[PDB]
Each structure stands twice: as structure tokens, then as C-alpha cells.
Ligand binder design. Structure first.
Ligand SMILES: [Ca+2]
Ligand SMILES: [Ca+2]
Ligand SMILES: [Cl-]
Ligand SMILES: [Cl-]
Ligand SMILES: [Cl-]
Lengths: 289, 295
């Protein structure tokens, strides 16, 4: 009835998803990657082209291009995909807060809108998106960023939820909360909301880092998380989690692709407009963050 | 035997760069070569820890810095030459063909007319054969292109040497590496393997006892120096017997397998301005520019 296919990118450890309703052919793509080499400034389309090819092989029609949040670890390929498979690009409405902060950091100037108008749909908690016979509910789950959404898919429970970076596989734990607007106490509460779904609900992760050298994995369940999550299993209190997450964040370095990712993703994945020589430039602020 | 000169190398673990302090203890005059401003590309943060080590050693020696020398326009680290100039003095010098590098990379970074392509950001532009005085020592700039169009090898000798104090030291930049590691890549704009072969042959025509101080150690513990004799005998790429054509074929094939250096784009846009950072935008913040799909 629902088909979920994950596509793992070794360079950024991101899992992008194809969500398919067999009965209608209607499809959503979630958290796509535009391949980017920060050493050379080169972009490639190999990861997004794999999604396009699978869409075509399934005879699928893409209706939604969903972002769980404004990613700091890879560039989105949403505009590239929209041109080539269709669909509407959607993200949580609090992307506008990210635009305000990062528009300032990158000195984006007056041509860069802070109203989320680069996106087709801005989503509020509880909004639903139709996908053939399925319904996708946008559940606001802030903590890693203030804009994070978890997409809960059911027949219009036997549910699936795309949790973004709100959870990892149980053996890895939880995501950092030191992005601007991030908050560990919020993340704890948003995780408790996700783990309030029925226990057999499948949870699909945005990232996997293969702790202890195990195989790549990116699906868990609400039950397995409550039982085994190394940071936030049943029994862990909010205060204890906040203290752990805050200390753990304090010791982290900046994600390698933070500055390139955020300036692109805050524009719905559009690249900066060309300068007068016809070249587009990412801007890296010195000693500013 | 060896000059009276003192050479101390400072290895940076992040970039594998070796920066040098060259000291004439008799006069107290000093040169600093190939300094590093520490730079984290993930966050845009700079630090001065590497440069501060050079400053502290200069002060402990009672030395006075007269020269801040670059062997070439570096693609693997940002220079700290201006930060050093302000705090220890000295003139910043590089080979005159830096102007060619400025033409190419001024365009790549769209730096515009405020960025001069005449080398005026540097205090001294050096031609082959130029000598720089350093107390009882003399530094001869030998042009050794190949890795880049501008590379210089700085050959140091006592200006007026007794019989047993005639041996030279040369700071070779990224031409030769240690014998077991070979030679540097030649795929930077204006780089040329055939030129590099010829330049290395010139460096290896210096007297056999000449000490050769390396710009990097990529296999660190640290190996700072080789000699002309050892390089001619042992260098895995360009020992005696390797023909020019064979070296070019090897070097070309090898370059094709390499990725871009991590700091290539931040380094060249700062080092083409003698290590100055870009001027701030209207909001008071300085930005590095990363060209998309342009190189
Ligand atoms: Ca994330
Ligand atoms: Ca070099
Ligand atoms: Cl606006
Ligand atoms: Cl904050
Ligand atoms: Cl060329």
C-alpha cells in the first residue's frame, strides 16, 4: 500500500526517501541531495538523478518535494528535482526565522526574501498533504532546528514517520541542538511526541553514521527507540537529557558543509544569483560564527 | 662544511606545512618563510597560534625579522605574512610572476578592479638571481617554476665565508619532496611538469652537500631536510637517470588521480593579496568567495 525507498549518500550520510502510493502512482521525495565538493566548488547531480530514474521506472508522479528541516550537512536538490519531475516544495513555516538569521550572516541583501516565498508550501503543525490514498501529516518537532517537521504517513495506524534529525537509530541516539534556534529541552519534548505514536510505527532517519562499524541502517520503530535509544530511551528524564545534550554539543565542531548548505537551503535550494562575470559564488563569512 | 646559519622548522599538523625561521646569530637578523594563518574551513574561523609560535621564537632569540618570504602562492594554507609584518617587521617578498597568478585568480574570484594584478600588495617582487642581505648571510632567489609559475627556491650562504663554512641551505618550496615521496603536483593553473623537471635539475646542480628544506611533510616524526646528493640518488620520481619525457608522463598521470587541496579556494584568494583578507562588505563582515562549477 505504502512503499518507502531510502537512498543513502556516503559523502554526507544523508538518507533521501521516495514515498510511493502503489495504488495511484503518486509520489513524494524527501530530503534530496545535490552533490557538492567543498574543496573544488563543483556540484554533481548523481544522487538526485537516482531518485529521478526510480520515479520514471515506477511510472510515478511526484506531487511533493518535502524538507524535514533546513539542512546544515548537505545541499538540497529540490529545485533541480522540481524542474525534472514536478511537484511542490514544502517545509515548516519557521523556515522564515532561519531566513532572518542567515540572511543577515551571509549579507544576502534585499533580493533575498525572508517570508519563505522561495518554497511552494509553508507547513504548520497538523497540516495534511494528500498523496493518492495516503495522507501525510506535518508534525512540528523542533529542537535540532526551530523549523523541524516529522512527516507522519497513513492510509487516509500502520504508520511510517520521516523524523528528519529528531531521532537517529537507537544505537546512535539524538542530534545536536546547537544550530541557531536549536534547543535540547524542545528536542526532548518533540521526541516524546514522536514516541507517543503507536509502537509499531516505522521511523525513517535522515542520517546514519554506522556506530561501531555496523551496516548502514535507517529504519527503526517507536518500540525499538523507547527500548534501546542510548540517549532518550524510556526512563531518561528531561533535565538529564538536556544536561547530556548540552555538554555533548559544547564539544562538537561545525559540520563540514554548514556554510555552503545553509545559504543554499535557506533559498529552497536555489544557488546564489550569478555575479556580473556569470559565475555564482558561495560566501564564507570570516570570524562571524 | 655548513654556514653559521640557524634554521628552525615549524610543522603544522592541519596542513602539513613547514614554516621556517632563518637566523644569523652573529647579527641577529632573521627571515620567516612560508608562514601559516590557521584557518578552519568548516566555520570560517581564523587563529594565530602558528604565527604566534614564530613570533615567540623570534623574541626569545633577540632576533629582528627583515624578510617575510613566500616560496610561491600557496594552495594549501593561508599565509600569515601581514599579521607577522605588523608584529615583527620585515618586508613581504615573493617571485615577480605572482602577477600572472593574480591575473588568473582575480578573474576566478571576480575580485574586480580594487584588486591589483601588479604585485603591489607585496613589498618586494623577486627576479631570478636577486640577492637579499641577512646580516652575515646572503639569500639568492632562484626561479624554479613548475608546481606554479612563480615558485622561487631561496639559496642561503655566508656572504663572506671561510673555507670550511661554504655549504648552502636551500628552501625549495614545493618542488622536491623528501626522496621517498618524490615531487609535487603540476596541475595548478600555469603549472607544468616539464618546467618542474628542469627546475629540479637546476636545484640538483647545486653542490652535493647543499641542505634542502622542504615546504611540506605529508608522511609524518618530521622530516625537514634532505640534501642534493641524497635526492639525486634516491628520489623516487626524479633521481638521476629519469628522463624528462618519462617524468612528464608519470607526473601528468599522477596529477590526474588527485583531488583538489582542501583549502585551495580560501588559500589562493587570500595569498594572491599577500595574505590580506578580503575587504569587508557593507555590514562589516569579510567573506571568502567560493566559485561554483568554475574550476
Ligand atoms: Ca540536520
Ligand atoms: Ca604548494
Ligand atoms: Cl521579506
Ligand atoms: Cl540560539
Ligand atoms: Cl594552464
Amino acid at each position: 500500500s505504502m512503499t518507502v525507498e531510502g537512498f543513502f549518500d556516503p559523502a554526507t550520510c544523508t538518507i533521501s526517501y521516495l514515498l510511493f502510493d502503489s495504488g495511484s502512482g503518486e509520489c513524494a521525495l524527501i530530503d534530496s541531495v545535490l552533490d557538492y565538493d567543498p574543496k573544488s566548488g563543483r556540484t554533481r547531480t548523481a544522487s538526485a538523478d537516482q531518485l529521478i530514474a526510480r520515479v520514471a521506472a515506477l511510472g510515478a508522479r511526484v506531487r511533493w518535494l518535502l524538507e524535514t528541516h533546513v539542512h546544515a550537512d548537505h545541499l538540497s536538490a529540490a529545485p533541480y528535482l522540481k524542474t525534472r519531475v514536478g511537484g511542490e516544495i514544502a517545509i515548516g513555516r519557521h523556515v522564515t526565522r532561519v531566513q532572518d538569521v542567515f540572511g543577515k550572516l551571509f549579507n544576502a541583501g534585499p533580493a533575498f526574501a525572508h517570508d519563505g516565498s522561495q518554497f511552494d508550501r509553508l507547513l504548520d503543525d497538523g497540516d495534511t498533504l494528500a498523496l493518492g490514498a495516503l495522507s501525510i501529516r506535518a508534525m512540528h518537532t523542533p529542537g535540532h532546528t526551530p523549523a523541524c517537521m516529522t512527516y507522519v504517513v497513513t492510509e487516509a495506524r500502520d504508520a511510517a514517520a520521516f523524523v528528519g534529525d529528531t531521532l537517529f537509530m537507537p544505537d546512535y541516539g539524538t542530534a545536536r541542538c546547537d544550530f541557531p534556534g536549536g534547543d535540547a529541552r524542545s528536542l526532548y519534548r518533540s521526541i516524546r511526541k514522536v514516541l507517543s505514536l503507536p509502537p509499531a510505527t516505522r521511523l525513517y532517519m535522515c542520517h546514519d553514521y554506522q556506530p561501531n562499524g555496523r551496516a548502514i541502517q535507517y529504519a527503526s520503530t517507536v518500540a525499538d527507540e523507547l527500548r534501546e535509544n542510548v540517549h532518550i530511551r524510556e526512563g531518561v528524564t528531561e533535565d538529564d537529557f538536556v544536561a547530556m545534550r548540552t555538554a555533548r554539543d559544547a564539544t562538537l565542531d561545525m559540520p563540514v558543509l554548514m556554510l555552503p548548505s545553509v545559504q543554499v537551503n535557506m533559498r529552497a535550494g536555489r544557488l546564489p544569483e550569478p555575479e556580473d562575470n556569470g559565475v555564482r559564488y558561495l560566501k564564507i563569512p570570516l570570524d562571524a560564527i
